[PDB]
Amino acid sequence: QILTSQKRNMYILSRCKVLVKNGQVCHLHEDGNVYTVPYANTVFIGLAEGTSITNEAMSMLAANGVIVFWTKGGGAADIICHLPQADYRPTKYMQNWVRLWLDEEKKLSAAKEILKMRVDSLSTHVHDFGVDVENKRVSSIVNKFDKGVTQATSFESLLGHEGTFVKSLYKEYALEYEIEFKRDHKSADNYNKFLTLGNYYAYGIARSSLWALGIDNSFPLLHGSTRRGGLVFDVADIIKTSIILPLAFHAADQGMSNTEFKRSCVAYFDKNDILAYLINNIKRLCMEN
Amino acid sequence: QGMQKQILTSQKRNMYILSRCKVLVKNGQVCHLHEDGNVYTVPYANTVFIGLAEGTSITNEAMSMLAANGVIVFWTKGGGYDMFAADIICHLPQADYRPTKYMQNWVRLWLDEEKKLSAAKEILKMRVDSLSTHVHDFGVDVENKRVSSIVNKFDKGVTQATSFESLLGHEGTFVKSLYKEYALEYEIEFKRDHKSADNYNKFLTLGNYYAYGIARSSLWALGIDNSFPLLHGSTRRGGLVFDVADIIKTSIILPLAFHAADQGMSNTEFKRSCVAYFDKNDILAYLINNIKRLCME
Ligand SMILES: [K+]
């Protein structure tokens, strides 16, 4: 009875057992401590190292539209993610997505639109610290990206401008914090670490938006190599450069803890209604044809 | 000392249902530790689907190692035919995200109204094939004259039909005529009705849900989205599940429900009889193979 986009909680759990105690979904730790999860008010649960989960907890989570995924996939994009399967989704959106996807020109047009959404999010979702997104250098980065997107004749061309856009923004944030930044997942520095961690939050909220509309992850708009993971990453990338990147670099520069950083992500998603934002934008991609 | 239940999916019995155990990594291998103390290894080469049923759990290490060996995990209620959580099944399990060839072909079929109608006629005829294949040692003899007249009437209507509307007409007549025959066989007055408290209607309602369950798994295993029905309305959530389940609702659910109601079974016993029939006669594989026939042609 709570709207999907109105759910405000989400979690990345480590070194604990997720189970049902006293009719509550909760996680139990080695010290005996039990912490509960508001199952009717939770967007997703991510499961990291040293975790386990029972079918009983899965049943309650799935019955309340909570998505569950594992941060280790066995291989970044190999994320194992379990969706609710018994509560049937709306049909209208996926039916329109299919017609959109099969039409190679409508698909290219949709791809350009979901790319430009990154620009819209960048100017809408701002922060009172770090990089001023309205300065001349970011304005130039945005313009070069927008014109390149407006003019491409192939998906492979779109990936070129997409790569340049993201990489240039990385360099601008690196300059702001006087660090030499190089994107690497294995890297132990807090900048890459908080980026990786924050991207799980972008993933989780993006899968949720897609599940809410019943649109399959197997129909991505941006394809080609390398561009693997499914539609969820096209959606998550909308807020990757606008929300996750500045939040991560801010946290890393202050020596913020993981707990505090994760809280800043959740707080920002709630304050700016990001889940509702993603859902509405995907739905408009889906219908206005 | 139960180890696993194997279910035939298509050509191989590569779906394992596990119950009352912890799935974990031991000695660099995925295993499941049971309450009795027994630990069993998971055969990667022979396993494609693992269903986690009642009293199960899994660690992040096991989940990770299973995925590395191309093993898909789903969560289900007891029996293994009531899945409530799983990922979507794509073309191949890791290196690419594209819909399965079955989903791709189903989509093409669904967008073409002339092919959609042809598919709708064939799934109705599958209902007839199930009626003669899946028989029972009790109740209605489906090979008597009265039932034969119902089938011939239904088959003639489906053949001559030129619209989905006409198909739905013959479909209704076929089902309620079977209701009448089973009511006549068990010598009872029966009007189909969800709001009734009698065991016959309750077992039909409950049994139909079991049929939706196994139909849901059949579509899922092929990576086919259930938002693309052939006969049920396009606005009907999970409409395709109901279309597939209708194949066995009159051949399996209907006689089992009337038999359970006649012998005064409990809800527990009734479900077990449905699940047992599903397992014994490989009903999941039956549905999967039929769905493949529809879109592969
Ligand atoms: K395998």
Side-chain angles (χ1 to χ4, degrees), chain A residues 158-186:
Chain A
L158 287 182
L159 294 181
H161 299 101
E162 186 271 343
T164 304
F165 176 71
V166 178
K167 182 177 177 57
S168 295
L169 287 184
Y170 282 161
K171 171 165 77 228
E172 201 64 23
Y173 274 84
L175 198 67
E176 170 63 28
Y177 291 96
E178 296 285 353
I179 66 164
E180 183 185 47
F181 177 78
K182 167 65 179 180
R183 185 66 181 122
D184 171 3
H185 293 59
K186 180 59 164 60

Side-chain angles (χ1 to χ4, degrees), chain B residues 278-296:
Chain B
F278 289 170
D279 291 323
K280 174 181 178 298
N281 297 270
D282 304 327
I283 297 311
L284 180 59
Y286 183 87
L287 297 174
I288 288 180
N289 290 332
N290 270 338
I291 298 170
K292 290 170 61 181
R293 281 223 313 269
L294 289 178
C295 53
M296 283 297 101

Side-chain angles (χ1 to χ4, degrees), chain A residues 48-55 59 62 73-74 81-85 88-91 94-95 98 207 216-218 228, chain B residues 53 55-60 63-64 67 73 75 84-88 94-95 97 99 107 216 225 227-228 234 236-237:
Chain A
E49 80 283 359
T51 58
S52 66
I53 187 162
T54 61
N55 82 282
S59 178
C81 169
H82 290 166
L83 313 172
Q85 296 287 338
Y88 302 133
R89 310 312 308 144
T91 69
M94 185 52 187
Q95 290 171 357
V98 148
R207 276 312 281 271
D216 289 334
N217 191 40
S218 53
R228 183 180 65 255
Chain B
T56 59
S57 66
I58 190 167
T59 68
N60 66 286
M63 186 63 72
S64 182
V73 174
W75 305 80
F84 53 82
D87 204 343
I88 186 179
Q94 293 199 245
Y97 265 66
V107 157
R216 189 166 65 241
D225 192 315
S227 291
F228 297 86
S234 60
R236 182 74 179 273
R237 299 198 183 190

Side-chain angles (χ1 to χ4, degrees), chain A residues 2 9 25-26 35 53 63 93 111 134 147 151 162 173 185 199-200 248 282 285-286:
Chain A
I2 297 175
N9 295 94
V25 177
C26 46
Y35 310 93
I53 187 162
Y93 311 111
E134 296 301 321
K147 314 251 270 163
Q151 252 290 99
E162 186 271 343
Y173 274 84
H185 293 59
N199 284 340
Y200 285 134
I282 295 174
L285 285 174
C286 186

Side-chain angles (χ1 to χ4, degrees), chain A residues 102-118:
Chain A
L102 290 186
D103 197 322
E104 290 295 333
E105 283 176 27
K106 286 187 177 180
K107 182 182 181 179
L108 184 64
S109 185
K112 296 179 181 182
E113 193 170 343
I114 203 180
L115 276 179
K116 287 182 179 179
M117 285 176 177
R118 304 191 192 195

Side-chain angles (χ1 to χ4, degrees), chain A residues 57-239:
Chain A
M58 282 299 301
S59 178
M60 197 168 306
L61 291 173
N64 291 274
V66 183
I67 292 185
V68 176
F69 61 94
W70 286 260
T71 54
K72 290 220 120 43
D78 311 324
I79 296 179
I80 310 162
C81 169
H82 290 166
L83 313 172
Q85 296 287 338
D87 184 76
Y88 302 133
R89 310 312 308 144
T91 69
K92 190 59 179 179
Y93 311 111
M94 185 52 187
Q95 290 171 357
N96 281 15
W97 195 265
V98 148
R99 305 186 185 96
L100 172 146
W101 194 82
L102 290 186
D103 197 322
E104 290 295 333
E105 283 176 27
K106 286 187 177 180
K107 182 182 181 179
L108 184 64
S109 185
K112 296 179 181 182
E113 193 170 343
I114 203 180
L115 276 179
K116 287 182 179 179
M117 285 176 177
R118 304 191 192 195
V119 177
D120 176 85
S121 182
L122 186 63
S123 62
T124 295
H125 308 135
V126 292
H127 309 265
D128 200 29
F129 48 79
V131 175
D132 190 346
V133 298
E134 296 301 321
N135 62 40
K136 287 178 170 52
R137 184 54 193 128
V138 175
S139 301
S140 181
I141 294 177
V142 164
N143 290 15
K144 180 184 179 182
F145 177 57
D146 176 86
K147 314 251 270 163
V149 165
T150 308
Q151 252 290 99
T153 67
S154 63
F155 295 88
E156 214 68 55
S157 179
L158 287 182
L159 294 181
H161 299 101
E162 186 271 343
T164 304
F165 176 71
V166 178
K167 182 177 177 57
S168 295
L169 287 184
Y170 282 161
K171 171 165 77 228
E172 201 64 23
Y173 274 84
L175 198 67
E176 170 63 28
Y177 291 96
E178 296 285 353
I179 66 164
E180 183 185 47
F181 177 78
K182 167 65 179 180
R183 185 66 181 122
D184 171 3
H185 293 59
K186 180 59 164 60
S187 184
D189 69 87
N190 287 320
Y191 297 92
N192 275 291
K193 158 182 162 183
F194 282 159
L195 273 184
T196 298
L197 180 53
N199 284 340
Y200 285 134
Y201 281 83
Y203 177 90
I205 197 176
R207 276 312 281 271
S208 181
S209 65
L210 288 178
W211 172 86
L213 295 177
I215 303 181
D216 289 334
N217 191 40
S218 53
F219 288 75
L221 294 178
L222 299 168
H223 60 285
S225 63
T226 179
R227 187 60 191 180
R228 183 180 65 255
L231 179 59
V232 52
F233 289 97
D234 296 335
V235 177
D237 275 9
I238 299 177
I239 61 177

